[PDB]
Design a protein around this ligand. Sequence first.
Ligand SMILES: [K+]
Ligand SMILES: [K+]
Ligand SMILES: [K+]
Ligand SMILES: [K+]
Ligand SMILES: [K+]
Ligand SMILES: [K+]
Ligand SMILES: [K+]
Ligand SMILES: [K+]
Ligand SMILES: [K+]
Ligand SMILES: [K+]
Ligand SMILES: [K+]
Ligand SMILES: [K+]
Ligand SMILES: [K+]
Ligand SMILES: [K+]
Ligand SMILES: [K+]
Ligand SMILES: [K+]
Ligand SMILES: [K+]
Ligand SMILES: [K+]
Ligand SMILES: [K+]
Ligand SMILES: [K+]
Ligand SMILES: [K+]
Ligand SMILES: [K+]
Ligand SMILES: [K+]
Ligand SMILES: [K+]
Ligand SMILES: [K+]
Ligand SMILES: [K+]
Ligand SMILES: [K+]
Ligand SMILES: [K+]
Ligand SMILES: [K+]
Ligand SMILES: [K+]
Ligand SMILES: [Mg+2]
Ligand SMILES: [Mg+2]
Ligand SMILES: [Mg+2]
Ligand SMILES: [Mg+2]
Ligand SMILES: [Mg+2]
Ligand SMILES: [Mg+2]
Ligand SMILES: [Mg+2]
Ligand SMILES: [Mg+2]
Ligand SMILES: [Mg+2]
Ligand SMILES: [Mg+2]
Ligand SMILES: [Mg+2]
Ligand SMILES: [Mg+2]
Ligand SMILES: [Mg+2]
Ligand SMILES: [Mg+2]
Ligand SMILES: [Mg+2]
Ligand SMILES: [Mg+2]
Ligand SMILES: [Mg+2]
Ligand SMILES: [Mg+2]
Ligand SMILES: [Mg+2]
Ligand SMILES: [Mg+2]
Ligand SMILES: [Mg+2]
Ligand SMILES: [Mg+2]
Ligand SMILES: [Mg+2]
Ligand SMILES: [Mg+2]
Ligand SMILES: [Mg+2]
Ligand SMILES: [Mg+2]
Ligand SMILES: [Mg+2]
Ligand SMILES: [Mg+2]
Ligand SMILES: [Mg+2]
Ligand SMILES: [Mg+2]
Ligand SMILES: [Mg+2]
Ligand SMILES: [Mg+2]
Ligand SMILES: [Mg+2]
Ligand SMILES: [Mg+2]
Ligand SMILES: [Mg+2]
Ligand SMILES: [Mg+2]
Ligand SMILES: [Mg+2]
Ligand SMILES: [Mg+2]
Ligand SMILES: [Mg+2]
Ligand SMILES: [Mg+2]
Ligand SMILES: [Mg+2]
Ligand SMILES: [Mg+2]
Ligand SMILES: [Mg+2]
Ligand SMILES: [Mg+2]
Ligand SMILES: [Mg+2]
Ligand SMILES: [Mg+2]
Ligand SMILES: [Mg+2]
Ligand SMILES: [Mg+2]
Ligand SMILES: [Mg+2]
Ligand SMILES: [Mg+2]
Ligand SMILES: [Mg+2]
Ligand SMILES: [Mg+2]
Ligand SMILES: [Mg+2]
Ligand SMILES: [Mg+2]
Ligand SMILES: [Mg+2]
Ligand SMILES: [Mg+2]
Ligand SMILES: [Mg+2]
Ligand SMILES: [Mg+2]
Ligand SMILES: [Mg+2]
Ligand SMILES: [Mg+2]
Ligand SMILES: [Mg+2]
Ligand SMILES: [Mg+2]
Ligand SMILES: [Mg+2]
Lengths: 59, 122
Amino acid sequence: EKQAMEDNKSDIGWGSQIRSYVLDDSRIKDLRTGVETRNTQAVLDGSLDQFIEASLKAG
Amino acid sequence: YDSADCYLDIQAGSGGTEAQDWASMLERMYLRWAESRGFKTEIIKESEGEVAGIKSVTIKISGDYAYGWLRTETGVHRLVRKSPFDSGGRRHTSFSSAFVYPEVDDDIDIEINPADLRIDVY
RNA sequence: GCUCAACGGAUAAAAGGUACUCCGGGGAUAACAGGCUGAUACCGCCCAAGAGUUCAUAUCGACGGCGGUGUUUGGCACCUCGAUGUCGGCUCAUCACAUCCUGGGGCUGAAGUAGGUCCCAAGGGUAUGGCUGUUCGCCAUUUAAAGUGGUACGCGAGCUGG
RNA sequence: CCUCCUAAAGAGUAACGGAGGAGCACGAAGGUUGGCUAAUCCUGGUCGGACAUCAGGAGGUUAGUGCAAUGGCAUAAGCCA
RNA sequence: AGCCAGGAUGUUGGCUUAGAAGCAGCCAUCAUUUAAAGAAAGCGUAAUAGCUCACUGGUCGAGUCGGCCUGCGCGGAAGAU
RNA sequence: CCGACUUACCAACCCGAUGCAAACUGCGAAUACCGGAGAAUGUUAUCACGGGAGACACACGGCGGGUGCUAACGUCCGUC
RNA sequence: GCGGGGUGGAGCAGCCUGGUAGCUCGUCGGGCUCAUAACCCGAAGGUCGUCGGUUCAAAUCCGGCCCCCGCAACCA
RNA sequence: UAAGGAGGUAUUAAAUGUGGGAAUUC
RNA sequence: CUUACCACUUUGUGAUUCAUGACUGGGGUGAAGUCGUAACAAGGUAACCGUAGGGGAACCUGCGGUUGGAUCACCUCCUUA
RNA sequence: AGGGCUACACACGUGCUACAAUGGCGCAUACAAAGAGAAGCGACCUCGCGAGAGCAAGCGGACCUCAUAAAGUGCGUCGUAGUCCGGAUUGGAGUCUGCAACUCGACUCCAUGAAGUCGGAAUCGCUAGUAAUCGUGGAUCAGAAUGCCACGGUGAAUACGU
RNA sequence: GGCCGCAAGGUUAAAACUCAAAUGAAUUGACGGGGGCCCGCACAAGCGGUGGAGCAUGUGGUUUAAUUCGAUGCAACGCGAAGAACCUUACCUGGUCUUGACAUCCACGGAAGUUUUCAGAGAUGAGAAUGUGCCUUCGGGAACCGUGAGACAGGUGCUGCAU
RNA sequence: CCCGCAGAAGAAGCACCGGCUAACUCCGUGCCAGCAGCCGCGGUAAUACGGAGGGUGCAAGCGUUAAUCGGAAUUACUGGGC
Ligand SMILES: [K+]
Ligand SMILES: [K+]
Ligand SMILES: [K+]
Ligand SMILES: [K+]
Ligand SMILES: [K+]
Ligand SMILES: [K+]
Ligand SMILES: [K+]
Ligand SMILES: [K+]
Ligand SMILES: [K+]
Ligand SMILES: [K+]
Ligand SMILES: [K+]
Ligand SMILES: [K+]
Ligand SMILES: [K+]
Ligand SMILES: [K+]
Ligand SMILES: [K+]
Ligand SMILES: [K+]
Ligand SMILES: [K+]
Ligand SMILES: [K+]
Ligand SMILES: [K+]
Ligand SMILES: [K+]
Ligand SMILES: [K+]
Ligand SMILES: [K+]
Ligand SMILES: [K+]
Ligand SMILES: [K+]
Ligand SMILES: [K+]
Ligand SMILES: [K+]
Ligand SMILES: [K+]
Ligand SMILES: [K+]
Ligand SMILES: [K+]
Ligand SMILES: [K+]
Ligand SMILES: [Mg+2]
Ligand SMILES: [Mg+2]
Ligand SMILES: [Mg+2]
Ligand SMILES: [Mg+2]
Ligand SMILES: [Mg+2]
Ligand SMILES: [Mg+2]
Ligand SMILES: [Mg+2]
Ligand SMILES: [Mg+2]
Ligand SMILES: [Mg+2]
Ligand SMILES: [Mg+2]
Ligand SMILES: [Mg+2]
Ligand SMILES: [Mg+2]
Ligand SMILES: [Mg+2]
Ligand SMILES: [Mg+2]
Ligand SMILES: [Mg+2]
Ligand SMILES: [Mg+2]
Ligand SMILES: [Mg+2]
Ligand SMILES: [Mg+2]
Ligand SMILES: [Mg+2]
Ligand SMILES: [Mg+2]
Ligand SMILES: [Mg+2]
Ligand SMILES: [Mg+2]
Ligand SMILES: [Mg+2]
Ligand SMILES: [Mg+2]
Ligand SMILES: [Mg+2]
Ligand SMILES: [Mg+2]
Ligand SMILES: [Mg+2]
Ligand SMILES: [Mg+2]
Ligand SMILES: [Mg+2]
Ligand SMILES: [Mg+2]
Ligand SMILES: [Mg+2]
Ligand SMILES: [Mg+2]
Ligand SMILES: [Mg+2]
Ligand SMILES: [Mg+2]
Ligand SMILES: [Mg+2]
Ligand SMILES: [Mg+2]
Ligand SMILES: [Mg+2]
Ligand SMILES: [Mg+2]
Ligand SMILES: [Mg+2]
Ligand SMILES: [Mg+2]
Ligand SMILES: [Mg+2]
Ligand SMILES: [Mg+2]
Ligand SMILES: [Mg+2]
Ligand SMILES: [Mg+2]
Ligand SMILES: [Mg+2]
Ligand SMILES: [Mg+2]
Ligand SMILES: [Mg+2]
Ligand SMILES: [Mg+2]
Ligand SMILES: [Mg+2]
Ligand SMILES: [Mg+2]
Ligand SMILES: [Mg+2]
Ligand SMILES: [Mg+2]
Ligand SMILES: [Mg+2]
Ligand SMILES: [Mg+2]
Ligand SMILES: [Mg+2]
Ligand SMILES: [Mg+2]
Ligand SMILES: [Mg+2]
Ligand SMILES: [Mg+2]
Ligand SMILES: [Mg+2]
Ligand SMILES: [Mg+2]
Ligand SMILES: [Mg+2]
Ligand SMILES: [Mg+2]
Ligand SMILES: [Mg+2]
């Protein structure tokens, strides 16, 4: 079971992103839900509730 | 298993040293979010990058529906910023992976039912 | 003046091998088989928490309890050490029933087919091969079925000798 | 070698039975005379506290015996001179 | 004992449940109609239903009930010439 | 610094009630053992000294026990 | 059956002979460096497997229990 | 001043640096 | 009818080629990993070539060879013109 | 409007003040430069231990005010101690500005009296009126400098050499 | 694979796959634990410090409702700030407004004002007195207050890697 | 093959536009989606992706793929080098 999960885990590299934190453009965007924010500092400080609630509501 | 406690594993990826620094940033972010939610966190294991950041970290999160709240963060997080580890200050892209899995209950040991065994002596 | 402590102290002074072996003895004493026993082993039964959608008892049955057999591994050391040859195979068997098939029945969570489980029943029947010295076992392919046992774990003054 | 049980109210009594110790110590830890009495707890009290020393109370040998256990020990066998 | 009647009401007591009506439970478990009729003892229904039954009346007309002590028996109880 | 409440709860000493013990005893027999006296009975049955031994593998049964499985025609004691 | 062990995060001492925990790495803080390592200067961290006993006092002595090691396990 | 010969000089230490860089050009 | 030749067909033993095979050798590749730092400067022991030995690895060492290696300043003393 | 920007296990940079006797304290007494001033500088005098208060000159200033420079010098004391060194912290009582000093102002008085006895590895500035040390003024500014900018006093050591 | 060798190996000699380069000489720089010559508180020669203490101040980190935002090798860290109790302030909590705190335009009213009252923490809302002027073809108009629209205002919001 | 009839009536698409290579802008997009013969393009101001407008080249065809030669003097006999 664990090995199947390890093979299921996408590699940590280009094209496997589900959340993009671009600090130059000052934009953070979740690829799955489309939720986008400009307060990168707050998100890095822990304001993940927007993304998490969006993902849960999407289900 | 949404109600159960969870484990969060953060691993650096393609960025290298920048990826490890980004992994440390993600660790700080998730710890702060857990504090905000009131969950309790502990560091089971950690491997720090030699130059900076962390190569990997395993954190235990305990709370009400902790796995339910954290399970959607599993995946790879892409970071784009002028790498502080590039002499030219170029805009590089680094990747870090967060994986969340529930805390499995310990299995009850089951004694072998003797009616399930055949014994031969010879 | 002795840890002569193996402490009524063999000598001041001493370890091993023998499957190359040998003698005198012992069934006073072990290995096989018999005997006593039955912890263990195998087979039953008692109570009934529970499993079984409901429902303890169709089928199972926890926590505990009571027996039977001799039937494994044992315990003992009664017989045999002026000798009771031993694993498996082969040939030939004979008995028990705790019945594998065929026969008869009860209940079924038995529509039929096909089963499950218990009771009665021992007349007859109850594989050939691959591997291994094998017993056992696994495997291949059959069969109505490929029973479980006792018989010095039947049988070397019948054979074999891996 | 010593102590207890097994050992069946005299002695003794076995097992590869159940439990422990000894192979010393002391010129005082011996003799005698005189004297004295414990553990433990409670209350109060500088440092001082769970536990030092001091005072009182309760208690009555539950202490102690140079070292195991048993039997003894207040007339003390215990403690001091 | 049989045997004949009966064997009601609020009310399916509510909840939790998928449904729960006496009869999965949880959970209260009362009063009313009275001769008596359980918020049910069992069977039974997916649930009801249904079948009983406890209770009680009426005909028949002498025993009937189930514990205690005790004697003797029965099952449990299968082996190899 | 004080401290306040409450308890899924757990509880020393003490008090009341109930058991247990080879290595527990504020109790305690029957027997057995030692000693004294007396009768009857017994071929002195008693003791001492000397001559000659044998035997020191026991078995089962009863009772009291250790061990074992409150197994063994088991094993080890005591006694007949 | 007979021997050993179990101590900062790791590997080893300290036990014997009771009074006291050490070494090396590792960790943490400050330096050096553009930065990391190396290097330098400082710190911290084990109530000693687990219970029990013995002792005025136990890492130490004794006894269980747990884990780990060795050996032995024969004639048969 | 030029040429030739000889002798002395001297650092022990110093590993590493991921992955997104040309408008200035008729 | 018979003999000769001979097609199909049969047997044995080789060759070659294709596919396949537990396992195994190296090769190439990679927007990050781990161990070093071998070369490029005299790359911090010049490098490289043939050969041999050794070593986690780049490599090291010996023997011979090549230049497709950097530097060659400065002080003192002596002699001659 | 109220709160935060002032938080506080901790790490670093830059500063001030010290650890004393080449000094602390008390008394007395010399020598500057530069600058600010009208919702300003504010004399004097009086009151207050003091910060300050009341009254009130002068000055848009080489005129008046801020505004005695301090180190120094003379005398006395302290006599080497955590001190008559240090002045953190804290308690009480006040002043001023300002609507308003709780969070969170400065200053004064009385009490208090911490660390600190010259600082590891390491590291900084300076070549002459410089370093070191001693005072003074300014902007910002209602109030709020150890910071900044500027001004004077005293006033060194050393540079062989690459 | 062949041939040669005792071996080490020699010799002969491919392919698949992969890349868009690999390479030679020279040029300008940059670099060297290459050379030479100079210089600088770079050493050397000194003097006084910092790192230890207390306090001040900035930072980081942490904390917080917020601890506003920036600077962050030398060349950030008593830096923007030549001076945060309120204001500042850009932050937070709460209370409030929506052509609007700050402008222009249009329409419509009202001199400007001044004084009050009440309620509210204040913003503000409601009310009451008091002036009603100045240019002025009694057309007025506009210094100034409101009200109603909508073009607009407004942002110390992001990008110093567009300037 | 010729004559007559009717009405513009029945008849235009494909590729491409960064350079090579004729033809450029807006919007969407944001190292994604995608493009790509080579060089390359896309990571939030794309003449290179996709749509649109405009344009260029061909045309009842236009592109892509496959194949040969050419360019390739890149096997050089013509006609190369060490
Ligand atoms: K002996
Ligand atoms: K021997
Ligand atoms: K032999
Ligand atoms: K039995
Ligand atoms: K038997
Ligand atoms: K024999
Ligand atoms: K049958
Ligand atoms: K049947
Ligand atoms: K039969
Ligand atoms: K076998
Ligand atoms: K048989
Ligand atoms: K036999
Ligand atoms: K025979
Ligand atoms: K006894
Ligand atoms: K005495
Ligand atoms: K005699
Ligand atoms: K006996
Ligand atoms: K080399
Ligand atoms: K070289
Ligand atoms: K190795
Ligand atoms: K300062
Ligand atoms: K204040
Ligand atoms: K003092
Ligand atoms: K210092
Ligand atoms: K001021
Ligand atoms: K050779
Ligand atoms: K400092
Ligand atoms: K600029
Ligand atoms: K866009
Ligand atoms: K030619
Ligand atoms: Mg003896
Ligand atoms: Mg013999
Ligand atoms: Mg015998
Ligand atoms: Mg036997
Ligand atoms: Mg037997
Ligand atoms: Mg015997
Ligand atoms: Mg016999
Ligand atoms: Mg004979
Ligand atoms: Mg039968
Ligand atoms: Mg028969
Ligand atoms: Mg017949
Ligand atoms: Mg077989
Ligand atoms: Mg065979
Ligand atoms: Mg048998
Ligand atoms: Mg047999
Ligand atoms: Mg046999
Ligand atoms: Mg025979
Ligand atoms: Mg043989
Ligand atoms: Mg006795
Ligand atoms: Mg007796
Ligand atoms: Mg005897
Ligand atoms: Mg005896
Ligand atoms: Mg005495
Ligand atoms: Mg006396
Ligand atoms: Mg019977
Ligand atoms: Mg004897
Ligand atoms: Mg004997
Ligand atoms: Mg005997
Ligand atoms: Mg017996
Ligand atoms: Mg016997
Ligand atoms: Mg100790
Ligand atoms: Mg490395
Ligand atoms: Mg690089
Ligand atoms: Mg190198
Ligand atoms: Mg080299
Ligand atoms: Mg070597
Ligand atoms: Mg040559
Ligand atoms: Mg070459
Ligand atoms: Mg405000
Ligand atoms: Mg601040
Ligand atoms: Mg001023
Ligand atoms: Mg001193
Ligand atoms: Mg003082
Ligand atoms: Mg001190
Ligand atoms: Mg100079
Ligand atoms: Mg000064
Ligand atoms: Mg070859
Ligand atoms: Mg110097
Ligand atoms: Mg300091
Ligand atoms: Mg800040
Ligand atoms: Mg900004
Ligand atoms: Mg400064
Ligand atoms: Mg404020
Ligand atoms: Mg608000
Ligand atoms: Mg810039
Ligand atoms: Mg063109
Ligand atoms: Mg295209
Ligand atoms: Mg762009
Ligand atoms: Mg665009
Ligand atoms: Mg396009
Ligand atoms: Mg083609
Ligand atoms: Mg050609
Ligand atoms: Mg050529």
